[PDB]
Each structure stands twice: as structure tokens, then as C-alpha cells.
Amino acid sequence: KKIFKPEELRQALMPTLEALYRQDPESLPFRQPVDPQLLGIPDYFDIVKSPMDLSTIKRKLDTGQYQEPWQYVDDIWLMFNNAWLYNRKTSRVYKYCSKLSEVFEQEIDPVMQSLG
Ligand SMILES: CCc1c(C(=O)NCc2cccc(Cl)c2)[nH]c(C)c1C(C)=O
């Protein structure tokens, strides 16, 4: 039941988020919230009830919204799962999502062993 200072959480986790955000071009579809009206996908919020993206996660990390590291990890998988759920497996975004998830696994694994 260890408690982490918000600042130490940000320090430990931010490099993993940076690694995802910097991944080009695979991060591009995940750098901002999905905007259904712009994209012409009006059923999006019927399928995805809990939208998530890298900018939102970044904000949560900056503003003390995570009490413990698994909450960050939860949001990352929420983001990936939303994309795997909504998009066809052949789609560009699905494929980018999978590649990003592999980057995430490599970066996160040592951090979370070293943390919680
Ligand atoms: C298909 C819509 C979508 C995007 C997206 O941003 N597309 C536009 C785009 C902009 C730049 C680069 C690319 Cl490749 C696509 N993003 C997500 C998570 C999704 C979904 C539904 O899951």
C-alpha cells in the first residue's frame, strides 16, 4: 500500500508517455481526443463510453489526477482498447494502435517493476 508523491509519479511515468507521443507516425491518431463530428463517425460514443487519448493522459499526469501508477496504466490500456474495439483489424488506426502498444510494453515494463 505504498503512496507516491504526485511529482515522483509524474517523473517516473512521463518518459513512457513521451516515448508514445513521439512515435511517428503511429502516435498521430492518438495525440488528441477522437472527434466524432469532424470524422463523420456519429456512432463512436455509442461504442466508446470512456474516451481516452495521449493529451488527456498528459493533462492528468500534470494536474495530479493519478493517485497511484496503475491508474495511469489503466488509462493507457483504455485508450488502446477503445481503438481496438471500434476500428476494424485491417484499418490503419488499428495497426498503429498495436504498434504503439508494443512500444508501451517495452517502456512500461521496467518502470512498473521499479515502482508498483
Ligand atoms: C479513425 C478515427 C480515429 C483517429 C484519428 O485520429 N483519425 C484521423 C487521423 C489523423 C491523423 C493521422 C491518422 Cl492515421 C488518422 N484516432 C482514433 C483513436 C480513431 C478511432 C475511431 O479510434
Protein topology:
Layout lengths: L5 H17 L13 H4 L4 H4 L6 H9 L6 H18 L5 H23 L2
Helix pairs in contact: 1-4, 1-6, 5-6
Bound molecules: the ligand CCc1c(C(=O)NCc2cccc(Cl)c2)[nH]c(C)c1C(C)=O.
Give structural notes.
It is found in: Cytoplasm; Nucleus; Chromosome. Residues 4-111 form the Bromo domain. This is Histone acetyltransferase p300. This protein is mostly helical. The chain has a single domain (1-116), classed as Up-down Bundle (Histone Acetyltransferase, Chain A), CATH 1.20.920.10. The protein is 65% helix and 0% strand. The protein has six helices and no strands. α1 (6-22) packs antiparallel against α4 (54-62). It starts with 5 loop residues before the first helix and ends with a helix. Ligand XDM binds at residues 28-30, 34, 39, 41, 44, 83, 86-87, 92-93.
Short summary:
The PDB classes it as transcription. The chain is mainly α.
Identify the notable features of this structure and list them briefly.
116 residues, Histone Acetyltransferase, Chain A, 6 helices, binds the ligand CCc1c(C(=O)NCc2cccc(Cl)c2)[nH]c(C)c1C(C)=O, Histone acetyltransferase p300, transcription
What Rg is obtained from the alpha carbons, in whole angstroms? 14 Å
Indicate the percent of residues in helices: 55-70%
Count of helical regions: 6
Taken from the alpha-carbon principal axes, the silhouette is globular
Topology order in helix (H) and strand (E) letters: HHHHHH
Name the CATH homologous superfamily.
Bromodomain-like
* Biggest sheet character: none
SSE-based structural type: mainly alpha
CATH topology: Histone Acetyltransferase, Chain A
The appropriate CATH architecture is: Up-down Bundle
Supply the number of structural domains. Answer: 1
Total count of strands: 0
Work out the strand percent.
Answer: under 5%
What small molecules does the structure contain?
Answer: ligand XDM
End-to-end span in angstroms? 9 Å
CATH class: Mainly Alpha
PDB class: transcription
Keywords: bromodomain, protein-inhibitor complex, epigenetics, transcription
Assembly: monomeric
Entry title: Crystal structure of the bromodomain of human EP300 bound to the inhibitor XDM1
